[PDB]
C-alpha cells in the first residue's frame, strides 16, 4: 500500500497518476500547501504519522489557471482569498519576476510557487517533527509541462530541515539566471 | 475545458479519470464537503462561480481508510479531528449502523457519508446562492469494478434526494442484517 | 499567569473579564468549537500543551444574534457557512425544539449550543490526549443572561471522556423538562 | 448596537473593552487576520456585510506571547503552524529586525505584525468589495498604559498607508539599533 503524497493543482489535466497505487493524493487550486489548512495539513499528517509516506511530491504545471487568476487580479469572490497565498508569492519575488517579459511570468511564478509550497511543507510541526525523530522523508517539488508533456524536478528536493534551507536557496538562485 | 467539479478520496486507488481535461479535481480524506472547509470551498466556488461547471461529483469508494480510520478510532492526532466529522455522521445514523452486522458497517458508513456531504454541498452559501439566481448546476453523489444515489437540481430536489437516500439505506438486505 | 481559556461569543456585550489576567480568551460567532478550525484548535492546542490551562469555559450568552441568524435563515453569504454548524444542532434536536413555543426557541437552542461546543471540545485530539497521559483539566459550559445579568453553568462539566459523555448526556436530558 | 469590530490577541490581559455593546469582538492568537482562516472571515463578513460595521479595528500588544513564541520557535506543536504565518512576516522584515538589538526585536515585530494584518484584512474580497461599491469603512491598526499606525479607506489609502507604517518603522531610534 501507499509510499508517495502528491500534492498537486485541481485544474491540472496530467493526473499523478499518469505523470509518475502508490500514490495517496490531494489536489487543491494551485498545489498549495497554506501553513493552517487543516485539509492540507491533516492529508500531510496522516501520510507521514500514520502511513509512514517516505516521499512528499509537490507538483505544479505550466499553464495553471489558478496561477494566471492570482496574476490577473479579478473579483473572482471567495477563491480570491485562497489565491492571496499566490500573490504574497509574486511579492515576494517582485524584482525577479519584473525583468522578464510579462508572457513569461506566469511559468516563472508556477516553478517559483512550487518551491515555496515545499518550503512550506518542511516548515509544518509535522514535517519538522518526523525529520527530527529520525523519520526518513523526502520532499520535491515538480513541474509538469503539456506543452510537452515533461518534467523539471524544480531543484527543490530535501530530506531534512538543513538541505530544505539549502535547496530552497539554491532553487531560487537557479530560477533566477534568465534565458535572454 | 472543464466540465466536472470530482470531489474525491486521497486514499481512492483510482484516478477520478476512470469514469481527461474535463475535469477539475479536489481531493482529501473521506471526500467531505466540512462547512467552513476554506479549501474544499473555494475549489467549488471557482468551479461554481467562475469556471461556470454545471456538475458537481463526490465520488466515495468501498475500502475507504479513512471511514475504517474514524470508525477504529485510535489516537492518530492531528487527522482525528477532521475524522470527527465521519463520526458525527455516524452518531447521527447509529441506530441505523448498529442493525448491521459489524463486517458490513464500514461500507454503510461510506454510503451514508457521500449522502450527508452532498447535502453539505447543496447548503453551501455558494450552491444555495447559485440555485436561487437559476444557474444550471447539479449535484451527484457516488461510490467506487463498478460505480454502485444521491442527485440534486434545486434546494427541494436535495431535501427530497438526501431524505429518500437516508431512507433507501435504511431498509436492510438479509445478508447484512446482524 | 493564565489559568482559565474562556471561549465565548463575539456579539455578547458582557466581556469574560466581567461576567468571571487569568484569563486567555477566544471568541467567534456563537462560541464555537468546530472540529476542523485551526484557529480554536490552535488556541485550545496552546493552553492545553503549553500554558498548561487546567481548565477552559465555554460562554454562551441569550439574545445571541449568532443564533438568531443561523435559525432565521436568510442568505447573509459567507457567514452562513459558518453558522451551518448549528444549524446541524437545531436538526440534531429538531423534535426537542418543536414542542416549545417559537419565542422559547432560541433560548434552549442557545444551552443546547454550548453543551454540543463542550462536546466537540473533549472531542478534539488535544483534550483526550491530555486527559489520557493523567493531566489535570477540566471543561465547562456556561450560558450568560442579561436580561438578567446573571449565570446558569449549563449542566457540562468534564473532567475526563467518562465524565464528558455522562454529562453531555444528562445535560440535554436536563434540557428536555419543559417549563409548562 | 455594534460600531466597531475589534480583532485582538488571546493572551491580551486587558478586555478590548478597555478603550459597552458598541463592540464585535474577535480574538486570536496574535490578532491574526489570516487570508484563509475561515474564522475570522466569517466575522469581518458579517459584521461588514450584515451589520454594517463602519471601522474594523486590529489591535496588538506588546510583551506578546503568541509573537515571542513565533520568535522562539521551539517544537510546541499545531500552534507552530498558525505562528508560521508570523515567522514569514518576520523574515519579510530580516534586513530591518537583524538591524535592532536583540531585546527590542519583539516589540517590533508586534508593531510590524498589525501593519501587516490590516493590509491582509484590506485585501480580502469582503473588504475590497465593500470598498468597491462605496461603503464606508475603516480599518485601524493600534498597539495597545498607552495606546502607542495604519489608517485605511480604500484600496489606494490601503497600500499608502501601510507602505508608509513600515517606512516609518524602519527609520530606527539610536537606543533601538544594535
Ligand atoms: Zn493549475
Ligand atoms: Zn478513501
Ligand atoms: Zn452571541
Ligand atoms: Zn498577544
Request: hydrophobic share 40%; glycine share 6%.
Amino acid at each position: 500500500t501507499p509510499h508517495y503524497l502528491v500534492i498537486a493543482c485541481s485544474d491540472s489535466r496530467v493526473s499523478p497518476e499518469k505523470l509518475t497505487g502508490e500514490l495517496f493524493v490531494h489536489r487543491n487550486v494551485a498545489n498549495q500547501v497554506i501553513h493552517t489548512d487543516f485539509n492540507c495539513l491533516s492529508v500531510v499528517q496522516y501520510a507521514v504519522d500514520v502511513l509512514k509516506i517516505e516521499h512528499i511530491i509537490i507538483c505544479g504545471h505550466t499553464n495553471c489557471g489558478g496561477i494566471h487568476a492570482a496574476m490577473a487580479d479579478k473579483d473572482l469572490g471567495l477563491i480570491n482569498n485562497w489565491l492571496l497565498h499566490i500573490r504574497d508569492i509574486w511579492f515576494k519575488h517582485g524584482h525577479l519576476l519584473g525583468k522578464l517579459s510579462p508572457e513569461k511570468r506566469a511559468d516563472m511564478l508556477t516553478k517559483i510557487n512550487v518551491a515555496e509550497q515545499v518550503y512550506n511543507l518542511g516548515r509544518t510541526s509535522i514535517v519538522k517533527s518526523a525529520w527530527e525523530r529520525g523519520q526518513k522523508l523526502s520532499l520535491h517539488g515538480w513541474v509538469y509541462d503539456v506543452n510537452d508533456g515533461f518534467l523539471v524536478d524544480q531543484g527543490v528536493m530535501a530530506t531534512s530541515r538543513e538541505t530544505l534551507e539549502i535547496s530552497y536557496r539554491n532553487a531560487i538562485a537557479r530560477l533566477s539566471i534568465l534565458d535572454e
